[PDB]
Design a protein around this ligand. Sequence first.
Ligand code: H01
Ligand code: MG
Length: 307
Amino acid sequence: KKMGLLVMAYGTPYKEEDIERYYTHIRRGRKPEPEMLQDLKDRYEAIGGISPLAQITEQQAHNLEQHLNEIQDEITFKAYIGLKHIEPFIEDAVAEMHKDGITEAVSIVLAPHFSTFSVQSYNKRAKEEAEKLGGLTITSVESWYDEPKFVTYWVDRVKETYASMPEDERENAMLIVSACSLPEKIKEFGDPYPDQLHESAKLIAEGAGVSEYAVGWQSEGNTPDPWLGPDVQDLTRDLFEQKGYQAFVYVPVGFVADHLEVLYDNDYECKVVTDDIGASYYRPEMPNAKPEFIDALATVVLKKLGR
Ligand SMILES: Cc1c2[nH]c(c1CCC(=O)O)/C=c1\[nH]/c(c(C)c1CCC(=O)O)=C\c1[nH]c(c(S(=O)(=O)O)c1C)/C=c1\[nH]/c(c(S(=O)(=O)O)c1C)=C\2
Ligand SMILES: [Mg+2]
């Protein structure tokens, strides 16, 4: 049995040549002004370049198809990447599947929390393009933050981080678990996105044994509408002022890979804030394409299919 494996993600530019069109796409067609563009470029430079980041999704999708075809023998999976904000787009991935003769696919988004703006939008764009082309069906994973193998990944890293600490810090530490902020209007549709982030943080804090943790949001866009808050920078400060913590540990659980939203908005922006206040900054390794994470994903996909 052959099945397409449609792996979807937000996307990151493969080359600097694409930073401009990437950002224009995110800004819903509004082209960056030259100084904004330069600012962006400088950020990617500071984190060591854009090229490494794109490759991680490629390796994630490839490892997942491989481990999927390794662990069972009734389905042969073939992976297709479809990205929201850069080529190959979701629609081009479905088009390729159809060309290769695929009639049934399973899709998964590389974002463990369901939202209307992210997961649902991707799943719908995929299904609508399958329907336009005819004779291809897609069953879509909606959320997987609660998969135990995925909780275990983050719990072990948090445990290792607290274990590595000075004794002084362990007893005066704060866990901040976060994901990408979205327009506050999502709550008009009862979007469970904020609740699922709360549940993630609890699952991970409790598995790690952590009584003190908070949920924050990051990497918000600039629009006239309110976005989900508090932002991690304001939360880190409010927390250092209701209780004066000495170490802050950041688990960007909404992100699966090293990209700008982590390497910059956490390791720079939040680290600017901890350094200032002389609390310590910790941020454990992102899952990227480590075996333990890909196994969790394979399990999510098989569970979805009824195995
Ligand atoms: C400048 C701009 C941005 N975003 C928009 C504008 C122009 C509209 C206006 O402000 O009047 C527009 C939208 N972004 C949206 C939505 C639903 C709109 C309205 C579209 C319309 O005009 O109908 C959603 C949205 N946006 C972003 C995401 S997320 O990454 O998935 O979280 C999502 C779901 C991301 C961003 N949007 C941004 C920026 S940035 O300030 O960094 O340049 C970012 C990082 C900026
Ligand atoms: Mg920002």
